[PDB]
Amino acid sequence: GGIAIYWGQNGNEGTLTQTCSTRKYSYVNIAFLNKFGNGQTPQINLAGHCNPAAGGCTIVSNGIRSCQIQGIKVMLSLGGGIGSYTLASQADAKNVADYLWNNFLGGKSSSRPLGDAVLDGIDFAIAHGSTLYWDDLARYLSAYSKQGKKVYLTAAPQCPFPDRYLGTALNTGLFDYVWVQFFNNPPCQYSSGNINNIINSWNRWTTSINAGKIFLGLPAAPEAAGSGYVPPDVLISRILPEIKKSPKYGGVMLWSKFYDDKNGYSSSILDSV
Ligand SMILES: CC(=O)N[C@@H]1[C@@H](O)[C@H](O[C@@H]2O[C@H](CO)[C@@H](O[C@@H]3O[C@H](CO)[C@@H](O[C@@H]4O[C@H](CO)[C@@H](O[C@@H]5O[C@H](CO)[C@@H](O)[C@H](O)[C@H]5NC(C)=O)[C@H](O)[C@H]4NC(C)=O)[C@H](O)[C@H]3NC(C)=O)[C@H](O)[C@H]2NC(C)=O)[C@@H](CO)O[C@H]1O
């Protein structure tokens, strides 16, 4: 399979171009558009990378294009651990979808946050706030694919199944890639010497929802999360030999680029993925 990586939440983690040039990642999720819905003006946060104001982050289009010519799919990630993002109604889901189309996809806007580049799809990283209308957002975004270029849909639900926020959206069967986050959740993550909870959780996710491919989401280092880190050797010798048997296995997802370089995680597991 391949490795999905989250980029954008630490200005010291290198440029998007450099991130994709590593040749270790097959998918890149730009984190995050952490503010939108309920009449709020959508706002993107890319840590210390760039200030989105006055097209200060339009330079990112160079990284997006650089990744795409290298066959890497790049998605805009909605939500994240911090933000006032939400959906007040189905009408809100429509407005956000139309906004996303014109500002990140094949639509048109004089103020596209990340430039003129056209993202491959949208990533759902909904962790809090509204538990409703995310299935509507997915449906509206997916319909835009009928205009010629497919709008990919990906999701980063936490490992507890079903996910309280993305459960219904995932039930639509419209998602291409689902990287379940097996961390910051004791009941379904790795614990010292115990892989039972993570494997058991993996089985729930791969024998339920209809998605293109399912990935094993993990923290790139102990610092990347409150808990759930898995040493490279354990992942390679105990976990991968099992989950790779599943025909839905798509690979591994890591949070994040910054911690990945610091701990050299993907550098150690890439060939086994
Ligand atoms: C898929 C998923 O759900 N993933 C989650 C994941 O979200 C969790 O990780 C945590 O995510 C949150 C975001 O949701 C991370 O929060 C980051 O934290 C950054 C570090 O503190 C912070 O970056 C700072 O951003 C400032 C702007 O807001 C930057 O300041 C600017 O600096 C410029 C010079 O560099 C200067 O010119 C500007 O004037 C100045 N502007 C301002 C306003 O100060 C600052 O430089 C930058 N710092 C760095 C180091 O880049 C982000 O703002 C903040 N994001 C948000 C949206 O608030 C949090 O760090 C993540 N934690 C970890 C451990 O990774 C993850 C947790 O395990 O769970 C996953 O499931």
Q: Closest Cα to atom 41, ligand 1: which residue? A: 48
Instruction: Give me 76's structure tokens.
Output: 């805009």
Nearest CA to ligand 1 atom 40: 48
Cα-to-centroid distance, 78 and ligand 1 (Å): 14
| Of 175, 18, 49, 235, the residue nearest 5 (C-alpha) | 18
**Cβ-based neighbours of 120, under 8 Å, separated by 6 or more:** 68, 73, 74, 75, 152
* C-alpha dihedral, 141 to 143 to 147 to 148, nearest 10°: 80
> 3-state DSSP: the chain helix, strand, coil percent, rounded to 5?
35, 20, 45
Contact 69, 117 (CB under 8 A): no
Token pair, residue 10, equals 């630490």
Q: Are the CB atoms for 256 and 224 separated by under 8 Å? A: yes
Longest dimension (CA), the chain: 53
Q: What are phi and psi of 181, to 5 degrees?
A: -90, 100
Query: Are residues 206 and 246 in contact, defined by beta-carbon separation less than 8 angstroms?
Result: yes
| 1-273 is classed CATH 3.20.20.80 | yes
The domain segmentation of the chain, as residue ranges, is: 1-273
Cβ contacts of 272 within 8 Å, gap of 6 or more: 235, 236, 240
Ligand 1 surroundings by CB, under 6 angstroms? 6, 9-12, 32, 34, 45, 47-48, 80-83, 125, 127, 156, 181, 184, 224-225, 255-256
Q: What separation in Å is there between the alpha carbon of 69 and the centre of ligand 1?
A: 28
Rounded Cα gap, residues 151 and 134, in angstroms: 16
Atom 2 in ligand 1: residue holding the nearest Cα? 80
Resolution (in Å) of the shown entry? 1.9
R_g over Cα of the chain: 17
Residue nearest to atom 68 of ligand 1 (CA): 225
For atom 33 of ligand 1, the residue with the nearest CA is 48
- Ligand 1 atom at minimal distance to the Cα of residue 45: 57
Q: Which atom of ligand 1 is nearest to the CA of 223?
A: 64
Residue owning the nearest CA to atom 31 of ligand 1: 48
